[PDB]
């Protein structure tokens, strides 16, 4: 015969959703140098990287972090005044034909009975002509705040961990196309490094595919899911702001010091980016060869620049040395494939509606001296044109905007599960 018996602490899990916690802010619990990766054996676990909730959680966490970083900073509400502007004409080239615009304006001082007369060099995209009088871009939509100069906010590794009764499962398989039964599985106490990078159309920095390029999509063929392309090898990219720029303090009240552009030292030129043309060519060749699997071995492919929309999505948008770079990637995604250094012009901004929100606009202070940013390009975010086209070249265009997808580029190997440690079974033991 057989009798029930209760086994406690039994290796059984089920998918579930709960809060996680970081490891590495002023509140992160420090990690440890023991990345204990117990290789689960003879296991095979279903994965769906498109619905692991924690990515959204991470997104939400980042949002809140950003907000709490900005709240104890000066609010430039008095700054919304009429601007007497003049187009700059000092050592200005034919590329940047009137982007910087030095604008005088009256500004409040410590004693609001008195005022002063100060200047600036706001970029064009932030100023709009109200009628020669201009206003800052945000002064009618949303309030304006400034980033505290202390924080040099940038990608800092933020490991993740599960809270004492939940497990984090990796997928060590190197051909994981994002969905299905992953054959090789291993748990970890905490996740590896994930740089919380903010980039659209081009996933700057991060983790590269171990063996070969990979194309991920919840459905490759429905022209409405942002395709992720993870590279096998990195692509070197160098972005530069070569205009020697200074910074000045202006007293906006009892202690509120607004950091404003004073004047550009020396010459002025366009702030541009460079990528090795040959390596980019080889990597895009690799990408199209991989795409031939999903779209057949006899399909023409076309690459065309972004199709339109907002400034943040129409262009490569990212952070570089405190400034916000908006590079026009029409100079790369222009090609066709049948069955040296590329140079990218880039614009700059000082008013950013980050996280595509409405009501919270952040002012990015300038940074003294020229700026350089060397980085590894690790993957792209593409979308298929469509048009059906009978059988014809299928066109791919850069996409992005929804930053969550970028988080999915590093949170696809992982999943969170809950342990059910109270099992039962039959055995020949009787009380």
């Amino acid at each position, epitope marked *: 015969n057989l009798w029930v018996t209760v086994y406690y602490g039994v290796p059984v899990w089920k998918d579930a959703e709960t809060t996680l916690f970081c490891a590495s802010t002023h509140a992160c619990v420090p990690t440890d140098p023991n990345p204990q990766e117990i290789h689960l054996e003879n296991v095979t676990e279903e994965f769906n990287m498109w619905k692991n909730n924690m990515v959204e959680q991470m997104h939400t966490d980042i949002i809140s972090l950003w907000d709490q970083s900005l709240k104890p900073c000066v609010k430039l509400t008095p700054l919304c005044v009429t601007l007497q502007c003049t187009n700059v004409t000092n050592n200005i080239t034919d590329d940047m034909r009137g982007e910087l615009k030095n604008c005088s304006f009256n500004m409040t001082t410590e004693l609001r009975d008195k005022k002063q007369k100060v200047y600036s060099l706001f970029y064009r995209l932030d100023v709009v002509q109200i009628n020669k009088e201009y206003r800052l871009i945000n002064c009618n939509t949303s309030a304006i705040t400034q980033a505290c100069p202390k924080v040099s906010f940038e990608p800092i590794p933020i490991h993740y961990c599960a809270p004492a009764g939940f497990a984090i499962l990796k997928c060590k398989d190197k051909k994981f196309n994002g969905t299905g039964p992953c054959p090789s599985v291993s748990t970890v106490q905490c996740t590896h490094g994930i740089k919380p990078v903010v980039s659209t159309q081009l996933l700057l920095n991060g983790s590269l595919a171990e063996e070969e390029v990979m194309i991920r999509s919840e*459905n490759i063929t429905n*022209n409405a899911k942002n395709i992720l392309v993870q590279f096998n090898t990195p692509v070197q990219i160098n972005c530069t702001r070569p205009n020697n720029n200074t910074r000045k303090s202006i007293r906006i009240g009892p202690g509120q010091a607004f950091y404003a552009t004073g004047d550009i030292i020396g010459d002025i030129r366009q702030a541009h980016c460079n990528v090795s043309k040959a390596t980019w060519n080889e990597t895009l060749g690799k990408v199209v060869k991989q795409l031939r699997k999903h779209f057949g071995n006899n399909t023409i492919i076309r690459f065309a620049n972004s*199709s339109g929309g907002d400034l943040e*999505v129409t262009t490569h948008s990212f952070n570089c040395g405190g400034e916000f770079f908006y590079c026009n990637t029409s100079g790369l995604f222009n090609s066709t494939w049948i069955s040296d250094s590329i140079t990218l012009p880039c614009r700059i901004k000082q008013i950013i509606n980050m996280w595509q929100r409405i009501g919270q606009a952040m002012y990015a202070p300038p940074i003294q001296g020229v700026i350089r940013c060397v980085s590894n390009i690790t993957g792209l975010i593409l*979308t298929r*044109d*469509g048009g059906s086209t009978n059988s014809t070249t299928e*066109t791919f265009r850069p996409g992005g*905007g*929804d930053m969550r997808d970028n988080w999915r580029s590093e949170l696809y190997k992982y999943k969170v599960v809950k342990i059910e440690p109270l099992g039962v079974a039959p055995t020949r033991c009787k009380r």
Partner: antibody, heavy 118, light 102 residues
Framework: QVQLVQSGAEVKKPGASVKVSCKTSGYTFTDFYMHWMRQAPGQGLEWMGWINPTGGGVNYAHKFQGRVTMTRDTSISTAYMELSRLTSDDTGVYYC?????????????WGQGTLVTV | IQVTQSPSSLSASVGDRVTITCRASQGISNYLAWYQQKPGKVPKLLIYGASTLQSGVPSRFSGSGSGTDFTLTISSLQPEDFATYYCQIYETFGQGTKVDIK
């Protein structure tokens, strides 16, 4: 309630540019993508394109690429479209439709409907 | 994605079983939707997500299938029910079909 008003009937001559509008009320504008559709008189309903009201992302189809351009306005909760370099075949009815998230099949609810005479 | 509606033309009477299908190229699982467009009025959605139906839809309207072939079927038919119907797949809308009394 959820209401999708659409622009009025417009009449025109070939070669110019024509603009249409679709105003929404009753739901979170940025949550649902917007498809634009067109049907020629007594014909099927060909898909003009789709737009994302979160960052302004848009995708057209080649059949109608390089001629169409659509944008969004989050303040009044509206979606605008324009067509340039028109051809006589383009005469017909245009529609605005609503799809959840980054999905394209369920075209729940619809606009009043615009007619364009090329 | 090739879409072939069937039948192109159809005449049916009040209260009868009427079925309409559309052939696809490859398999799309539940990914399918059917709509109606009464003449003059705006098109409205009948079925989505393969069998799944819309809210406020009478249960007489029901679709299902698999692979390349699916079918929307109706048993009861009140006079407003007949209209032009449209099968849809990806960016490959069906040509449509004509439903008339008797």
């Amino acid at each position: 309630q959820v209401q999708l008003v659409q622009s009025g009937a417009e009449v025109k001559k070939p070669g110019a540019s024509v603009k249409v509008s679709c105003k929404t009320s009753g739901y979170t504008f940025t949550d649902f993508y917007m498809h634009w559709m067109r049907q020629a008189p007594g014909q099927g309903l060909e898909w003009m394109g789709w737009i994302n009201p979160t960052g302004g992302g848009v995708n057209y189809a080649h059949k109608f690429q390089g001629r169409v351009t659509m944008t969004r306005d989050t303040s009044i909760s509206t979606a605008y479209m324009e067509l340039s370099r028109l051809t006589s075949d383009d005469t017909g009815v245009y529609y605005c439709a609503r799809s959840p998230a980054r999905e394209l099949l369920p075209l729940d609810y619809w606009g009043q409907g615009t007619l364009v005479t090329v | 994605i090739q879409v072939t509606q069937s039948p192109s033309s159809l005449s049916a009477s009040v209260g009868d079983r009427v079925t309409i299908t559309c052939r696809a190229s490859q398999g799309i699982s539940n990914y399918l939707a059917w709509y109606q467009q009464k003449p003059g009025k705006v098109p409205k959605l009948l079925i989505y997500g393969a069998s799944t139906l819309q809210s406020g839809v009478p249960s007489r309207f029901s679709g299902s299938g698999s692979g390349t072939d699916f079918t929307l079927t109706i048993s009861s038919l009140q006079p407003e029910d007949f209209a032009t119907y449209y099968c849809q797949i990806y960016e490959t809308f069906g040509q449509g079909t004509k439903v008339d009394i008797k």
